[PDB]
Amino acid sequence: SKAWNRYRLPNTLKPDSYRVTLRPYLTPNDRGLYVFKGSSTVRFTCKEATDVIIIHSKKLNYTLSQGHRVVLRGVGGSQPPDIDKTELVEPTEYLVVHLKGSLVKDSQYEMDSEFEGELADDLAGFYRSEYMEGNVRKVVATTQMQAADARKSFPCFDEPAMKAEFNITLIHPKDLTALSNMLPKGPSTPLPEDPNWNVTEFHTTPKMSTYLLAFIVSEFDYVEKQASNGVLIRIWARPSAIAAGHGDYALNVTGPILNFFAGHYDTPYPLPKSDQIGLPDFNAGAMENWGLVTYRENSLLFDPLSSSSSNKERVVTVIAHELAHQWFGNLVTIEWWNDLWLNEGFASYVEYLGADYAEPTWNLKDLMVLNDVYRVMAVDALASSHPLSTPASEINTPAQISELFDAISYSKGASVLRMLSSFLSEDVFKQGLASYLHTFAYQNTIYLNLWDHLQEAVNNRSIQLPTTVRDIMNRWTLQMGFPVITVDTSTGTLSQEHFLLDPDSNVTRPSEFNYVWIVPITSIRDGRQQQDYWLIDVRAQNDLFSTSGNEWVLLNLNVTGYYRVNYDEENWRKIQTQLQRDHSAIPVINRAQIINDAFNLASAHKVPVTLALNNTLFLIEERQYMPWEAALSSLSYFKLMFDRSEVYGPMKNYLKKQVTPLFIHFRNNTNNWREIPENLMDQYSEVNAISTACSNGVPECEEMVSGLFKQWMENPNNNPIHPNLRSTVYCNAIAQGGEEEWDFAWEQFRNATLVNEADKLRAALACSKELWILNRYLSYTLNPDLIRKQDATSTIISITNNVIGQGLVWDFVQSNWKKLFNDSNLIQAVTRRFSTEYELQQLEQFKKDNEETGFGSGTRALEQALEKTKANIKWVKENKEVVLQWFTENSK
Amino acid sequence: SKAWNRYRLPNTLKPDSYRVTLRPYLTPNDRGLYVFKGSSTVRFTCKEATDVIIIHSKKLNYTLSQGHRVVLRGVGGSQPPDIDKTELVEPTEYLVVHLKGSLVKDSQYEMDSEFEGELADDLAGFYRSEYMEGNVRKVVATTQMQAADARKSFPCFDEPAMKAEFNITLIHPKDLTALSNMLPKGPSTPLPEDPNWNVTEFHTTPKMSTYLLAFIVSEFDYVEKQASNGVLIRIWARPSAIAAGHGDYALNVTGPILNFFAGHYDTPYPLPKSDQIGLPDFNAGAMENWGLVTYRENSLLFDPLSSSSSNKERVVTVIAHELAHQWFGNLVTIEWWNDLWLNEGFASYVEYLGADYAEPTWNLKDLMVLNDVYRVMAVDALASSHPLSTPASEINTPAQISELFDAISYSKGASVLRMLSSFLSEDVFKQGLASYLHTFAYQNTIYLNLWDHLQEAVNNRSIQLPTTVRDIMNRWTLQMGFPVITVDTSTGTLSQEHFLLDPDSNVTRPSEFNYVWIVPITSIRDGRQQQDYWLIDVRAQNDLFSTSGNEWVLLNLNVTGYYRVNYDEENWRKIQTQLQRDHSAIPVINRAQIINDAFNLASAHKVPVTLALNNTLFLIEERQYMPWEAALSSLSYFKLMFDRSEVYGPMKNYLKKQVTPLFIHFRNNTNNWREIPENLMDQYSEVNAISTACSNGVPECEEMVSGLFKQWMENPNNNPIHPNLRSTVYCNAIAQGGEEEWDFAWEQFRNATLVNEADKLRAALACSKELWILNRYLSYTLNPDLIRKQDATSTIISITNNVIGQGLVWDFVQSNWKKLFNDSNLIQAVTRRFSTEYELQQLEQFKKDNEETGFGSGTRALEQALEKTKANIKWVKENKEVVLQWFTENSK
Numbered sequence A, B: 001s002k003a004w005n006r007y008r009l010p011n012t013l014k015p016d017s018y019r020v021t022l023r024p025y026l027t028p029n030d031r032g033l034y035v036f037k038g039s040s041t042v043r044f045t046c047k048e049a050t051d052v053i054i055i056h057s058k059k060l061n062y063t064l065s066q067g068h069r070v071v072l073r074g075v076g077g078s079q080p081p082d083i084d085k086t087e088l089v090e091p092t093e094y095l096v097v098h099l100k101g102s103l104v105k106d107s108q109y110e111m112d113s114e115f116e117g118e119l120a121d122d123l124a125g126f127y128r129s130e131y132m133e134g135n136v137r138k139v140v141a142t143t144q145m146q147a148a149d150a151r152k153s154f155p156c157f158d159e160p161a162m163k164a165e166f167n168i169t170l171i172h173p174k175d176l177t178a179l180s181n182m183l184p185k186g187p188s189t190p191l192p193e194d195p196n197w198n199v200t201e202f203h204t205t206p207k208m209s210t211y212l213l214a215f216i217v218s219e220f221d222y223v224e225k226q227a228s229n230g231v232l233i234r235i236w237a238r239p240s241a242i243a244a245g246h247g248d249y250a251l252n253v254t255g256p257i258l259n260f261f262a263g264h265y266d267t268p269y270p271l272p273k274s275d276q277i278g279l280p281d282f283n284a285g286a287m288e289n290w291g292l293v294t295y296r297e298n299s300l301l302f303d304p305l306s307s308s309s310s311n312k313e314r315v316v317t318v319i320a321h322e323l324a325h326q327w328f329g330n331l332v333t334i335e336w337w338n339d340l341w342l343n344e345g346f347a348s349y350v351e352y353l354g355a356d357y358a359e360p361t362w363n364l365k366d367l368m369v370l371n372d373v374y375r376v377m378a379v380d381a382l383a384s385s386h387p388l389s390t391p392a393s394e395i396n397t398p399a400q401i402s403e404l405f406d407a408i409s410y411s412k413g414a415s416v417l418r419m420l421s422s423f424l425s426e427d428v429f430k431q432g433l434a435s436y437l438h439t440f441a442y443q444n445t446i447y448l449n450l451w452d453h454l455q456e457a458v459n460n461r462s463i464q465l466p467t468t469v470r471d472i473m474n475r476w477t478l479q480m481g482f483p484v485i486t487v488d489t490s491t492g493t494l495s496q497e498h499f500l501l502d503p504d505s506n507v508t509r510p511s512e513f514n515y516v517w518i519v520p521i522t523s524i525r526d527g528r529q530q531q532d533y534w535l536i537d538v539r540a541q542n543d544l545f546s547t548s549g550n551e552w553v554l555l556n557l558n559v560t561g562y563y564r565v566n567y568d569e570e571n572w573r574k575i576q577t578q579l580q581r582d583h584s585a586i587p588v589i590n591r592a593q594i595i596n597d598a599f600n601l602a603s604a605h606k607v608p609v610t611l612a613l614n615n616t617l618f619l620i621e622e623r624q625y626m627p628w629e630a631a632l633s634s635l636s637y638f639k640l641m642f643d644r645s646e647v648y649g650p651m652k653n654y655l656k657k658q659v660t661p662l663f664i665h666f667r668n669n670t671n672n673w674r675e676i677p678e679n680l681m682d683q684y685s686e687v688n689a690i691s692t693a694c695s696n697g698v699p700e701c702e703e704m705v706s707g708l709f710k711q712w713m714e715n716p717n718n719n720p721i722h723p724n725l726r727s728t729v730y731c732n733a734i735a736q737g738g739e740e741e742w743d744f745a746w747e748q749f750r751n752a753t754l755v756n757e758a759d760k761l762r763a764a765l766a767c768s769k770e771l772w773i774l775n776r777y778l779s780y781t782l783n784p785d786l787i788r789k790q791d792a793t794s795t796i797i798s799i800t801n802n803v804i805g806q807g808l809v810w811d812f813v814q815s816n817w818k819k820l821f822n823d824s825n826l827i828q829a830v831t832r833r834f835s836t837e838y839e840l841q842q843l844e845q846f847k848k849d850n851e852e853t854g855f856g857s858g859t860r861a862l863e864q865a866l867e868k869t870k871a872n873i874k875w876v877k878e879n880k881e882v883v884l885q886w887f888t889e890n891s892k
């Protein structure tokens, strides 16, 4: 009941501005520690009389000044009380300054601090990243503040609605460049006590959130170009990468995307520059720090001679995502983390608009169906999912915050925005967004603020909707999950219900909306688009959905809406007949839909599993990427359920049959692998045909990959494998080979100069079929001299995806949990095969054994794993015989 | 405290003779059950007045007669009390007849019973075995009584010291032959109620134990020959096997071995015939029933065109073993099961004398070192081992009895007899045994009775020993374990201590002998045998064991003694120098000894592990079977400890290097696999070279086995693989191949006509590297339509030996224990890889979870698994780095 034991800051104090001086030491001290020393003054306003200053502080040591950890001074004549004592409260991460009296309402004060922290290799706060240039160790001081680590670099009111201006000074070796959000204010000057160091002050930032600050000291090089909106773009990276031209693609796209967004939203980018910088050690994909956007090397750099088309797509989309955040996150910021989707849903959707602008021939916007809609529907069909906007009172700790950086906030966020754009029209949507951005510039928002501005646009344009934007969109935002819409084409009746993969699962989170949605329904009849419809009730009838004779209908054209569709068996049969007659008559995205929806419906007991399997029969003559990818994504579940069972042979036999003609088509079309297709989707289709053919035993594919890899081994400096094919050739050559192939690939990995090439090798090494080799590799993932800490969990996950790595990794996780934790994606990956009572009991015991240690940001993933495991046991029992028989009877 | 709740029969009643009539029904009844109906009268003597008749009865249903389950009558004027009531007490397996008064001391009585039981497919008591002749189902009624199942066929005083004569009548279909211990008494007559059945009475048996009775009804055929001692031998088997000539080898050897034993022990076989019969369904290897010896088909039948030399050796040794029992077990019988070694140790040793007689060119007696001494030293180095003669009061239940049919009773029994023969001389030994057999014919013995007769021979021959036979041999019989004898060749000092694989293990069983032995020590100096020595104390000094200059000594010539030997490092170094200079200077058995002892000493921390590994270096030029087999046996532990670890590659690389020249030698010597070596040991050496080369990655071996198997697949009716090579070619071709090879081998298995061929295929199928295939195969082992119940556990063990089958089988055992148990070798096999705290905790939880179900005859194996797992964790921690480095540095 003491304020310093509660996780949210009091509302009594609100900062105005800060100055911060930080000095990283890039050589270890006598104790072998890398440290930084700093000072700060924060000016703040008392909003309500209080005798305590509660401010965030994490892993900082204070130098005493005038008898206490801090000094408190008046501003504009205020006369603050004396300090009694200070304390550091570790759980809530506060410095608590107990005062001898109360501060005065609507008065200002300043607090000065002098402090020191570790420049750790922990990827959080002010931290160190390392690389080698030949035999010379290069050490970089860099930052990652989001969500709650700005407090690990200096004391601050570290919540996103506590916006302030920041005056940053970096003291650094004179040979190294200091970078921050803003440009330097005047020249750098020698430090008086030691002229081997420079003092670099930066101009004051705009009013902004603490989680967006960045401080970097390095000897990076850069390329640069003024963008057409007058903003300076620089791409910074290790000197060898810049000299090799690997920053050139980022330079080609960054300024043009930034200018595109500024124009599209009628809202200028207000800062003089936007630096993009690639770090050797970085936790997430990238981070949108305002003026100094940071990236993993693999998300920013690109080598036209060794990076794949998929890598190129990653670069432009991640850049577009980070640039989208300059508007959705930086200029306008979430009030609190519970509404994270206002940042992340927007950036995840808007990234495709930016990438499409930069690369108009690629057709990327379409991939959102796979990358966003279907990615998130897997978890959002669980009773243990969570709403897009969780109630703010439930999100308090750093672990609970971290947990929200998930498929819901990103991918469901993007999907619901895609749907909204569709029913408003994009022109009306962007009009409402321009108004939103203008109104809340330099401020913070909740979900209701967005609806108000979209409503203003709807009202201006006289768009008629069945109710207000707020009431439609609250259904998609405040309750978890999504509906299945079931059509009876005999009568034209539609109904909706909350779609649950397990009908038996226990939804315990109440919804004031009763898990009923207001649903925009598009549709086609025999390939022709019909009038749009709004389903407002649990059930309705309309002749739009009635058919007679040979006619079929499909709902959700191009899957713009966040919902699944079921039909009566007769309409499904007509759809299957269409797929056999001329599959091109159904839009490509809807061919993906038919497959993906039917597999999920089968899990939920809404269609027979043989109906979903029958929907894959036409794939033998499908050449498009997307329907194959949707099928392989759904069948991934079958592999997880069955790859340790009698069902697996027939399953592989079936996939071998379905993919062989496609594999042969590509063998011929590429002139025996000499060329790659012109169209991006065809390039992806080719990779999937190869991967699928090889995984399922097509002998020509096994011969091809082993032959190519052997040719590379014989000529290591002349890699004969096209970059697009490397991941799959490397993985399958390692799977088909033995110790000699593995060791070759490991040495290539250790000696890698490109992160893209290292990443492909690192995944490939997990493809060994030999248990002893997987165990040895597991031991390397934990050694930061061998595999970078940023990549440890990724590599462990690659091992667990291998059927032979399953028991290995699960036993390792159970055995080492305390050590791993104390010193989410992992839980999800290691548990997804579970389909037995034995495994369930292990998982329940794992929860019990580690309840005290806690599961931190993996807490919800554990609940979800328990729910899925229970569903899987029942699903396997119900389906194993029918599935075995189906694959056996259809694979010949 | 009621006698009927105690496991041992009272001493109040002792049977004299029995008549038993049994009638099996070889077609199912209306309820689908196969049943047998029977009657019995037992005549018994009251030794002490009692008002209860406690007699064994298991799974029998009684037909009421004169108002009770049985009728009690007087003999020779006795006048028994009326019966009050009877009860069946299931735990102790008794029929309990409560009387209205007491029986009279030294009077006789008769008890009549009429009963019915199931002719189950459970391999115990009177049971059914099944085979197909074309499409016609053949059903056989057959028996297995040992230890405690005679009571499952008729009520009896079912303990081995309750000897009696038996008068057996079988009522059977007129077309089927009835067989029992004795020959028929007069002609068979039609059953009056139904002339489709014959009534066959057999002559009275000698006085004998209930566990030796046999009753068989079949349409088997036979071959026959009168043996030179006038005894009729017949070999009986399914008609197709006999017609094919597959009983001919057994006929060649059986009579001659029987006559050899009768001559050797100066003790005639007293019965008119000895039938050998091979059953399609049979639990153990064979069973020595007096006059009607039963066998698995794979232990009796032999096909010169498809069976291997190893199979041939199995046939002659198992026949010799069963014939040895006619003297050691049947004529003279253990008093109680605690002294089982008096039957099984003798048969296990004497089998080699008989087999050597029949096949004098094979040199089999030598293999006892591998098959007996080293087989048992593994378990007898645990604190949880047990003495050869366990105290009788500890052995009470059928589970505790069953448990004693183990490596101690068989192999340690044989080893201690080998040692005894060596120090007495065989001539003195057999003189004492002839006296033993003469004195105790038709009676029962304990271990002390044997020593008394051996002493009589020693006394007659004036053999001088350091004490009596009893006092020497009690050290080897009444306490578990064996000594390590450590020699300091600097001073000629020897000492002994109880050898424990884990120095930290807790020996809780006290020994009145303080784990000190009296040890006969043979020795050689530079290849020349020295005078024998007796170590009587914990330590001694003698110049026999002192060396100077270049001389070396070795103790335990040809490993006649049941002990391990360690030396000072200097003598070990001279031994290693001898192995490098001219390994032929050390007797072949002692080359096996040097290897095997050093590996075990290394586990016990008595020598560095690198010393044991260094002792294998000379194997690169070793061509003899035995030292290689001893090395591979010891290295099996390294494989179990390391085949899921980084150590395994270097280990395989080392074995590949060591075996390649031998593999190439055989490739050349056999004219590229066209021929097999003439000498039996060389034939075994060839198989081991192939197995080892293929398991460890010799490319010429992988090519050879895959090529041969493919050639067979292309010509299924013309198998190109020599029988000696089939097990290893089949296993490695399956491991190297995929689903197509596996499926070919499975269909060959299902269609097999020879048990020998089926057995090789059944083992080979467990060699798949694909987890899904092993899981599918696991599901077949449990289906009695696919794999015979007699072979279920064997096949499961083959799966668990595969590194990929480890997690599979262990999880299966944990998950299905209650079901498996309620509806020992398995425990030992599934746990032998355990070397981690994680696995230990699983094992401890497994014990806890199933404590109530109990572990029956697997109880001691579980205690041993716990002890070994704890030792393994420590051993891996202590040795993994040094072993990794050694294999890496020595494999190049």
Ligand SMILES: *[C@@H]1O[C@H](CO)[C@@H](O[C@@H]2O[C@H](CO)[C@@H](O[C@@H]3O[C@H](CO)[C@@H](O)[C@H](O)[C@@H]3O)[C@H](O)[C@H]2NC(C)=O)[C@H](O)[C@H]1NC(C)=O
Binding pocket: A017, A018, A019, A041, A042, A043, A165, A166, A167, A204
């Ligand atoms: C971070 O740097 C900025 C920019 O230099 C500082 O803002 C400046 O602060 C000064 C001193 O407070 C402002 O002048 C004063 O304004 C007050 C009204 O609040 C007036 O009563 C005084 O007479 C005086 O003129 C100045 O306007 C302001 N400049 C800008 C552009 O806003 C800021 O204080 C720095 N913060 C910290 C903690 O160092």
Ligand SMILES: *[C@@H]1O[C@H](CO)[C@@H](O[C@@H]2O[C@H](CO)[C@@H](O[C@@H]3O[C@H](CO)[C@@H](O)[C@H](O)[C@@H]3O)[C@H](O)[C@H]2NC(C)=O)[C@H](O)[C@H]1NC(C)=O
Binding pocket: B017, B018, B019, B041, B042, B043, B165, B166, B167, B204
């Ligand atoms: C199993 O069969 C044997 C052999 O037929 C039976 O042994 C025979 O039993 C009879 C009747 O007891 C013996 O004759 C009797 O001997 C007693 C002395 O105990 C004497 O007082 C009577 O005057 C009478 O002669 C006969 O000697 C004996 N034969 C042999 C060779 O031992 C045995 O009884 C049968 N057991 C059962 C339970 O059916």
Ligand SMILES: *[C@@H]1O[C@H](CO)[C@@H](O)[C@H](O)[C@H]1NC(C)=O
Binding pocket: A033, A035, A036, A060, A061, A116, A117, A118, A119
């Ligand atoms: C902060 O102080 C603690 C406690 O004295 C010390 O262990 C730690 O090393 C200090 N951190 C730094 C970066 O100096």
Ligand SMILES: *[C@@H]1O[C@H](CO)[C@@H](O)[C@H](O)[C@H]1NC(C)=O
Binding pocket: A174, A175, A176, A177, A178, A188, A189, A190, A198, A200
């Ligand atoms: C360091 O300061 C000097 C002036 O004192 C300036 O010329 C130089 O460019 C600065 N260098 C860096 C890397 O900040």
Ligand SMILES: *[C@@H]1O[C@H](CO)[C@@H](O)[C@H](O)[C@H]1NC(C)=O
Binding pocket: A248, A249, A252, A304
């Ligand atoms: C960047 O654009 C230039 C000019 O259009 C082009 O030549 C170059 O290939 C582009 N670089 C990359 C890496 O795509």
Ligand SMILES: *[C@@H]1O[C@H](CO)[C@@H](O)[C@H](O)[C@H]1NC(C)=O
Binding pocket: A431, A432, A435, A453, A456, A457, A460
């Ligand atoms: C709506 O129209 C009003 C009045 O013309 C205008 O001022 C306002 O900016 C418009 N809002 C939106 C969201 O278009």
Ligand SMILES: *[C@@H]1O[C@H](CO)[C@@H](O)[C@H](O)[C@H]1NC(C)=O
Binding pocket: A608, A610, A611, A614
């Ligand atoms: C799947 O197709 C088969 C073969 O045409 C058909 O018999 C079966 O009914 C289909 N399954 C369903 C659920 O319609």
Ligand SMILES: *[C@@H]1O[C@H](CO)[C@@H](O)[C@H](O)[C@H]1NC(C)=O
Binding pocket: A716, A717, A751, A753
């Ligand atoms: C490792 O990479 C270096 C530098 O990029 C290259 O020169 C060399 O060929 C590679 N080393 C090996 C052993 O292949």
Ligand SMILES: *[C@@H]1O[C@H](CO)[C@@H](O)[C@H](O)[C@H]1NC(C)=O
Binding pocket: B033, B035, B036, B060, B061, B116, B117, B118, B119
């Ligand atoms: C013995 O009786 C029990 C109980 O009535 C019955 O279940 C069982 O089938 C009987 N056994 C035989 C072989 O008839």
Ligand SMILES: *[C@@H]1O[C@H](CO)[C@@H](O)[C@H](O)[C@H]1NC(C)=O
Binding pocket: B174, B175, B176, B177, B178, B188, B189, B190, B198, B200
């Ligand atoms: C059955 O009995 C008859 C005499 O009744 C006899 O001739 C025949 O050999 C007997 N057969 C068998 C198999 O016991």
Ligand SMILES: *[C@@H]1O[C@H](CO)[C@@H](O)[C@H](O)[C@H]1NC(C)=O
Binding pocket: B248, B249, B252, B304
């Ligand atoms: C049995 O002995 C005969 C005669 O010596 C011999 O010809 C035959 O090969 C032997 N049979 C077997 C199966 O060894």
Ligand SMILES: *[C@@H]1O[C@H](CO)[C@@H](O)[C@H](O)[C@H]1NC(C)=O
Binding pocket: B431, B432, B435, B453, B456, B457, B460
């Ligand atoms: C020992 O000798 C006695 C007297 O000659 C003889 O009767 C007895 O059978 C012999 N015993 C043994 C075991 O040789």
Ligand SMILES: *[C@@H]1O[C@H](CO)[C@@H](O)[C@H](O)[C@H]1NC(C)=O
Binding pocket: B608, B610, B611, B614
């Ligand atoms: C094993 O042999 C190596 C190489 O000759 C030697 O250095 C080492 O001492 C030996 N190990 C032992 C325990 O003697």
Ligand SMILES: *[C@@H]1O[C@H](CO)[C@@H](O)[C@H](O)[C@H]1NC(C)=O
Binding pocket: B716, B717, B751, B753
């Ligand atoms: C199975 O064995 C039979 C009878 O021994 C043989 O005739 C036939 O060739 C085998 N069947 C197959 C399919 O190989």
Ligand SMILES: [Zn+2]
Binding pocket: A321, A325, A343, A344, A347, A348
């Ligand atoms: Zn983002």
Ligand SMILES: [Zn+2]
Binding pocket: B321, B325, B343, B344, B347, B348
């Ligand atoms: Zn035996």
